[PDB]
Design an enzyme around this catalytic site. Structure first.
Site, mmCIF file in Angstrom:
data_model
loop_
_atom_site.group_PDB
_atom_site.id
_atom_site.type_symbol
_atom_site.label_atom_id
_atom_site.label_comp_id
_atom_site.label_asym_id
_atom_site.label_seq_id
_atom_site.Cartn_x
_atom_site.Cartn_y
_atom_site.Cartn_z
ATOM 1 N N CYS C 152 0.841 -1.185 0.000
ATOM 2 C CA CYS C 152 0.000 0.000 0.000
ATOM 3 C C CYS C 152 0.889 1.252 0.000
ATOM 4 C CB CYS C 152 -1.029 -0.019 1.121
ATOM 5 S SG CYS C 152 -0.369 -0.431 2.750
ATOM 6 N N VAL C 156 0.342 4.403 -2.392
ATOM 7 C CA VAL C 156 0.053 5.732 -1.895
ATOM 8 C C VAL C 156 1.053 6.740 -2.478
ATOM 9 C CG1 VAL C 156 0.111 7.206 0.167
ATOM 10 C CG2 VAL C 156 -1.245 5.076 0.166
#
Ligand code: ICS
Ligand code: ICS
Ligand SMILES: [Ca+2]
Ligand SMILES: [Ca+2]
Ligand SMILES: [Mg+2]
Ligand SMILES: [Mg+2]
Lengths: 477, 522, 522, 477
Positions: C152, C156
């Protein structure tokens, strides 16, 4: 199916048989006429099975040990002979009881003399004497012993009566020799008779001179309820709610003491006529106890039975009778409202032993089902006499049906449900016909009384309307 | 009473207060029941070492046997033959029980006839029954063969099957060419596994004894496989699968796998599959014959060696790792086929699972029972897993078999606390699991009553049953399982480790008490 | 203390009186623990309808989820390809967890790398990580393909995987022809199953998007099979088995069954079997493509239809009877092969089992959870068994799926008391099995904590777990099972009916209390 | 293998790597020299992992949530960010505790803010506030909340400190924000440090001026025992039998209150130096509490430790110390007598995290086994300093070992046993090398203390001498 098609069905099926068998089997198959009160005009029963035709029948040992004696919970029953019989029958029959198994109750245990060659050749009588002492040592709370003879006992000339008398006197113990060897009779049926006679001769008279029993006007015994899935308990609760005192049940959840107390009751209530009419008649001759047949299958027969039983007593029992019936009215009515719409018009064929092939018809009818064929493994003509008025006109009757005949009858009649035993069940499921075990209740029940009718209804519906039956044909065939 | 929206069967209906009250009143009024305090006393006594000593001195009384009678086996053997009707000469009561016993285990139809001998046959025997029985059976059920065994009545009366069948053919009840192999199957000798042996040797004799002149060992380039008494469908299937994977030509002699697993598709098939007559006739032309369960195939062995001249190899039942290895190596040797990559990998998968699972299996104590070959295979695999087979019971076992198992135990550190019992029953085993408590039992459904008895003493004394064997009547479709080969070993391993982990979860499920050890990961 | 002849691990060691006393003193001395009466009072409260209403109003808090994050599925998909290394671009903690999660379920090695992006990568991006990572991986573990997903952190900060891999090739870190398919797999979108779909579409794209002009639908005479996120080895195996039996040419696209079941033979195989690069390159020449789990293969579907021009059939997961039938008839239609005799029989054996077992299953009430396709297949089969799937929970489910399951429930009388929950977790499910108690839960190992909770309320409120799903960490080798096809249906049927009978045996094991119903035969 | 042989094993293995990786990994592999007190002269540690080489390392979240905070039993720990991290870590670590899960204890539960894209894009602070209220409602007996940041939290600029302060003030509740995002540091290790500093800043000071607690001169805390399979409990019982009062355990079976009471103790006993030296140093600086490292693996280290601890007190404790040692003497002797003969001479290679790779060496040696290789995932040079004197001359040391390295080392050295983690276990079992999980204890344990050594010994023997290991070779190959 008309009367002419059914007669024509009987003839076509019989065509496969050699002549001797064809002639015999023809007498054991009939199209019902409910005008007929003398079944001997219509059908032959309680005769030897034809060799090689895959009868569903058992033996005298099954009728004595499996059915009448085996359920008596505080006695030890010895399957006396080779190991087979005791092993196959061990806990096969759901004759329910309350007890501490191996300690004060022994029903689901298999005690056996496990005959070897030396026993066949030199006799089992010394082994049986030794067996009885080993039983007394290891099972001290047993309240009696029965010796259930398997095929070899009588054939080798053993004297179990003498062992019983000698060991019985030595140990101050009731020891009951039972000559239920499987070569005797033609079926379970003679097993019942022999078993009843053994009760008469060796147990039932023990308290003939004892006047200590505190009797009441309302004392009854349930005779010939073997408490399959708790059937006798679901019967008994109604009789006691009606104000009666059930002193004994023969023989589901039965105790030796309650058998010995039975001669003290006011009325013997016979469910299974076939298996217990013998002792019932004895008790009327000897002790002047009247007996009456009843039927606790479905609300109609249960209500009718409760009323008929109460009519034997005073006003107070007849009044309590009406209170019992009123209590249970909303319960069985709820069962009818839920299940009868799911089962109405469905056609049933049965094949069972000596009682249920007629006794359950009223329960089916209470759910709007139609019994289009029925029959018995080992019924006598007095059973078919009771059957003919219960069954519809032009329905099929079969006595000691062959596997071949049963399969062929079903293929033609195409019932919606069949109710029979474990030797039949897998055959018909494969044909895609819903099947209910009407001996074992398919591990369900009880089916007796008002509480049992709910379970019976749920069970017939669960099986008859099961989704599995829509799936037997692959969508590409 | 019943509420129509939640109908109660016997359980839990009879726990309602009115039924409890009524059953108390029956007890107190009429049962003259021993006081509860005394029942408890006797129960406690039956769990003691003192009671075990009296129990093991029994000479006459058998309680809760772990064997059945010869003709059960003969029937199972007969069922493995193409369009064959098992026919038991004697009393029909026997046949009702044979059929039911198998019906309940397989949840399948089981076809078997009797010739319904009655008391009258004591005067001059069962010859007329045989004549009409054979005729009636042939006409009505249309088998291509009838395999005759006997019930104890017929054995005690001394009926001569051979003469009786010969006379049936002589007087034209059945055609002379119609196959009617037979075997005497006295229930008072050995057990159900002996029946299988006897029946099989009777069938093999029937098809080969008289046509041996033209037979050449090896000429058909096949291996005969005789499975013995076998009640797991997976066992027939895995032997065939393994042999086809090796590209070994084979004849499975007695194969009921098809007839005990017919589809529910709208027709009842009385017969399906099975060893063909052509296979039994051609069997002496095999390279060799392998007996999967040698300890109840002694008679077959003598016939196959004595008459077929096959050098039957000394193989243990192919159960567990070592014995499956040995079976495959012997089959490789006899057939000349190498063990293929596919079986080598399956073997390694089994070993992988044994490494994955060894920590939970290590030192776990078992009581177990069954037939001789099944019991010794299980014993052997347990030792391979590092389990302790503490109580080993084979009711129908014999002295030589017991010696063979005692040697297997002696050859492993995991056997040091193990005793083998022969001619002892489940009431004997009951004592052993109270006095010398194992972790689990591996047995058939009769074991559930021992589990019930142990629980009654206390939760801490309960010995859970693992159902492996025959019969299993209180679970569905376990008869589809496998116990032979790597596949079988993997199924057994999985059942064992997961039985241990289920029990551990049960014992660690107590909130703020034992659930500190209720691990997500095991 | 320990006795050396019987060493106690934590259970039962800590039940010794000295540990109990010590833990009581710790509690009373230092833990400032809420009084037991208050703990009982709050416990009781969490079992109520009042608490359940509050529980179901949660918007922000998730408790005990029943899903994982995208890259977990990407990894499993990648593993299904021949000599492929799953490579997750981003943070290494993720990969340690992925590997451990699958290690614990499969009890096998799980090979997966990271490029170990650190805080410093937030300035520039993970470009240098991708360059060195690919080079290092290719050199060290010698895969033929590296299948790239993301954690993640990498999502991001916005790392462009395409450009990064392209630059790795441009600058000579890896050969330009070395295959490096990729997918963005953001954990904050969907779930693990979404990752699988993204990874697979990525790989399909890589091998086919730029070379369509030579492709001809039908030309290879095969059917592509896309299994989706699948953690039962039996499921890959039964699909291949059924198609081979049918004589259907097939390509299973993502097949990890070999690399998740390597033998323990003395060598570690990092790679084994798997879908070949050629299978993927040639997939557009298939007759058609079948998606076994359509509710998480939507992106794959759009690509297969959009680019390969395969008319992907509208099939449900082949679970239970009707849907196995439909799968097989669709495959027959596409392939022109008839459904063989062998699958017909198998089907009928399944139906036979349904007829044998139906009385114990009838009306049994289940709570159950898992991934969308698995859950709806289980729902379908339960309805076919005459069971009542009362609480149906799919944490990663969606509205369209729910409507589909609601329509399946509406078409059956057995569906009348069923509710489908999406976006709810096992803490929600906990409430439901308290307030509307089923007979059993079907779920993964996380359900064991709910069984524990229910038992704490009392024995008559205990809802036993039946373990079917992912992950199963507290039982060994269940990942070898099957849930697809007739085989899978038979395995599920057997587990269900034996779970019922095991529980009934427990409830009826009470001597002179409930053992009147402790039947030998069921 | 000799020093020269091992040096060349290191060189042959490194040949496979590209230049950059080769040069780095060269610095992280060494041949032990027990003389060396300054490990920075022979091995580099605590550095970034080389991309793509299959490190076994985890992240800072694993270090804070999984290791330090997660065990604290009466607090609720929020895995804050997407659903993955909380789910993979849920009940994976056997940090045992007594409590009522879901009511007053929450250790094996997974609480998460399960971030969706709207939370990534617009921030999770409002969701976290709502989440805290939802926790307070549904879990009223929680005694505090920690917020364990997953990767996205810091990347997207969330202010969990402000949310913690605001909601903590509103509810009068300890809410601890922990910045343990996995992009931070290089391993689990920085997570410990961040977690320690979070305890310091938000919890430990709470009772600084509160003196209601009655201290004794014998008050200790166990610092850095996570109670794996009950390890802390097995340790604790010995300290209390020695007459000490164990006020706190950090953090296995730990409560928030005993963390809060810890600054009242007389001595901090540090098991896991690596994870909890930070807070131990803080407590010596702030409260003047001395701390000391100990080792309760195996009788030798446990005895040495008990004696070292007791020497800090007075003669009464030293006396009970000798009484404890006398009590457990026959027990551990019987363990040695049974298992040392079964394990003597066997060679072990270990790879674990931050402590056990040196700490368990003594337990192995008490069974006559040799640790021929050891290494750490995330140790610093101060750990290697403690390792070199525990390991033998010319043994192999490996820091942040690659999958590749570990396999190749094992292949050449052929240890009898490997002790490592779940990501390694199945590799080595397939190579036919007995493997013991040395994080999770393979679902066994405890291994701490005397009670633990028995289990440790049983466990190593059961695996090393298991019959499965002689069976990997098919007899036809
Ligand atoms: S005793 Fe008889 S065969 Fe009357 S031998 Fe048989 S438990 Fe049947 S029709 Mo099994 S005369 Fe009872 C019977 Fe009926 S065993 Fe049960 S069901 S009412
Ligand atoms: S805290 Fe550390 S990796 Fe010291 S992060 Fe790790 S429960 Fe290891 S070697 Mo798992 S520094 Fe504890 C550890 Fe050791 S989780 Fe356990 S075993 S003694
Ligand atoms: Ca069946
Ligand atoms: Ca494995
Ligand atoms: Mg245990
Ligand atoms: Mg204990």
């Amino acid at each position: 199916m008309s009367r002419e098609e059914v007669e024509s069905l009987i003839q076509e099926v019989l065509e496969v048989y050699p002549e001797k068998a064809r002639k015999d089997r023809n007498k054991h198959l009939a199209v019902n006429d409910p005008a007929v009160t003398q079944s001997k005009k219509c059908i032959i029963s309680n005769k030897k099975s034809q060799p090689g035709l895959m009868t569903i029948r058992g033996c005298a040992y099954a009728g004595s040990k499996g059915v009448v004696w085996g359920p008596i919970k505080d006695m030890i029953h010895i399957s006396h002979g080779p190991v087979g019989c005791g092993q196959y029958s061990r806990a096969g029959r759901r004759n329910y009881y309350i007890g501490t198994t191996g300690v004060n109750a022994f029903v689901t245990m298999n005690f056996t003399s496990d005959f070897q060659e030396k026993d066949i050749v030199f006799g089992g009588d010394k082994k049986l004497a030794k067996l009885i002492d080993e039983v007394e040592t290891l099972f001290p709370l047993n309240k009696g012993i029965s010796v259930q003879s398997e095929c070899p006992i009588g054939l080798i000339g053993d004297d179990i009566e003498s062992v019983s008398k000698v060991k019985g006197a030595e140990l101050s113990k009731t020891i009951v020799p039972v000559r239920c060897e499987g070569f005797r009779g033609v079926s379970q049926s003679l097993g019942h008779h022999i078993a009843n006679d053994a009760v008469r001769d060796w147990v039932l008279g023990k308290r003939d001179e004892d006047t200590t029993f505190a009797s009441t006007p309302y004392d009854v015994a349930i005779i010939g309820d073997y408490n399959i899935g708790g059937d006798a308990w679901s019967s008994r609760i109604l009789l006691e709610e009606m104000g009666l005192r059930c002193v004994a049940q023969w023989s589901g959840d039965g105790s030796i003491s309650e058998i010995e107390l039975t001669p003290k009751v006011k009325l013997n209530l016979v469910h299974c006529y076939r298996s217990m009419n013998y002792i019932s008649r004895h008790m009327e001759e000897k002790y002047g106890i009247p007996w009456m047949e009843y039927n606790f299958f479905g609300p109609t027969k249960t209500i009718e039975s409760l009323r008929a039983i109460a009519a034997k007593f005073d006003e107070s029992i007849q009044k309590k009778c009406e209170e019992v019936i009123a209590k249970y009215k909303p319960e069985w009515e709820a069962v009818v409202a839920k299940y009868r719409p799911r089962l109405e018009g469905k056609r049933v064929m049965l094949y069972i032993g000596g009682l249920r092939p007629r006794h359950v018809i009223g329960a089916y009818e209470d759910l709007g089902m139609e019994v289009v064929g029925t029959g018995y493994e080992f019924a006598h003509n007095d059973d078919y006499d009771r059957t003919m008025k219960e069954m519809g006109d032009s329905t099929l009757l079969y006595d000691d049906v062959t596997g071949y005949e049963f399969e062929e009858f079903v293929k033609r009649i195409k019932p919606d449900l069949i109710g029979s035993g474990i030797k039949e069940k897998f055959i018909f499921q494969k044909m895609g016909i819903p099947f209910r075990e009407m001996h074992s209740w398919d591990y369900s029940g009880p089916y007796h009384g008002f509480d049992g009718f709910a379970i019976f209804a749920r069970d017939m519906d669960m099986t008859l309307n099961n989704p599995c039956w829509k799936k037997l044909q692959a969508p590409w065939e | 009473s019943q509420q129509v929206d939640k109908i109660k069967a016997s359980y839990p209906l009879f726990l309602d207060q009115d039924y409890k009250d009524m059953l108390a009143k029956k007890r107190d009024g009429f049962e003259e029941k021993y006081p509860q305090d005394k029942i408890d006393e006797v129960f406690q006594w039956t769990t003691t070492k003192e009671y075990q000593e009296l129990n093991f001195q029994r000479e006459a009384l058998t309680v809760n046997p772990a064997k059945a009678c010869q003709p059960l086996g003969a029937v199972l053997c007969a069922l493995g033959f193409e369009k064959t009707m098992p026919y038991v000469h004697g009393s029909q009561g026997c046949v009702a029980y044979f059929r039911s016993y198998f019906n309940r285990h397989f949840r399948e139809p089981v076809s078997c006839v009797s010739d319904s001998m009655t008391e009258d046959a004591a005067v001059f025997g069962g010859q007329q029954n045989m004549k009409d029985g054979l005729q009636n059976c042939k006409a009505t059920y249309k088998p291509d063969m009838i395999a005759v065994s006997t019930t104890c009545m017929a054995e005690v009366i001394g009926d001569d099957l051979n003469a009786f069948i010969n006379n049936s053919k002589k007087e034209g009840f059945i055609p002379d060419e119609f196959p009617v192999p037979f075997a005497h199957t006295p229930s008072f000798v050995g057990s159900h596994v002996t029946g299988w042996d006897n029946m099989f040797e009777g069938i093999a004799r029937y098809f080969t004894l008289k046509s041996m002149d033209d037979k050449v060992v090896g000429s058909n380039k096949k291996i005969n496989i005789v499975p013995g008494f076998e009640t797991y469908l997976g066992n027939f299937r895995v032997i065939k699968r393994m042999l086809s994977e090796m590209g070994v030509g084979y004849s499975l002699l007695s194969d009921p796998e098809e007839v005990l697993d017919t589809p529910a598709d709208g027709q009842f098939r009385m017969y399906a599959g099975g060893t063909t007559q052509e296979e039994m006739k051609d069997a002496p032309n095999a390279l060799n014959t392998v007996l999967l369960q040698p300890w109840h195939l002694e008679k077959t062995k003598k016939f196959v060696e004595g008459t077929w001249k096959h050098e039957v190899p000394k193989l243990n039942i192919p159960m567990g790792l070592d014995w499956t290895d040995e079976f495959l190596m012997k089959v490789s040797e006899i057939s000349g086929q190498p063990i293929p990559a596919s079986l080598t990998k399956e073997r390694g998968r089994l070993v992988d699972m044994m490494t994955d699972s060894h920590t939970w299996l290590h030192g776990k104590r078992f009581a177990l029972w069954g037939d001789p070959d099944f019991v010794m295979g299980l014993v052997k695999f347990l030792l391979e897993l590092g389990c302790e087979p503490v109580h080993i019971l084979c009711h129908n076992g014999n002295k030589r078999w017991k010696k063979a198992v005692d040697a297997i135990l002696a050859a492993s550190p995991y056997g040091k606390n193990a005793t083998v019992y022969i001619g002892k029953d489940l009431w004997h085993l009951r004592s052993l699991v109270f006095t010398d408590k194992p972790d689990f039992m591996i047995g058939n459904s009769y074991g559930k009553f021992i589990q019930r008895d142990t629980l009654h003493k206390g939760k801490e004394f309960e010995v859970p049953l693992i159902r492996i064997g025959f019969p299993i009547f209180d679970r569905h479709h376990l008869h589809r399982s496998t116990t032979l080969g790597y596949e079988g070993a993997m199924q057994i391993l999985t059942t064992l480790v997961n039985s241990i982990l289920e029990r551990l979860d049960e014992e660690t499920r107590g909130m703020q008490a034992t659930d500190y050890n209720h691990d997500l990961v095991r």
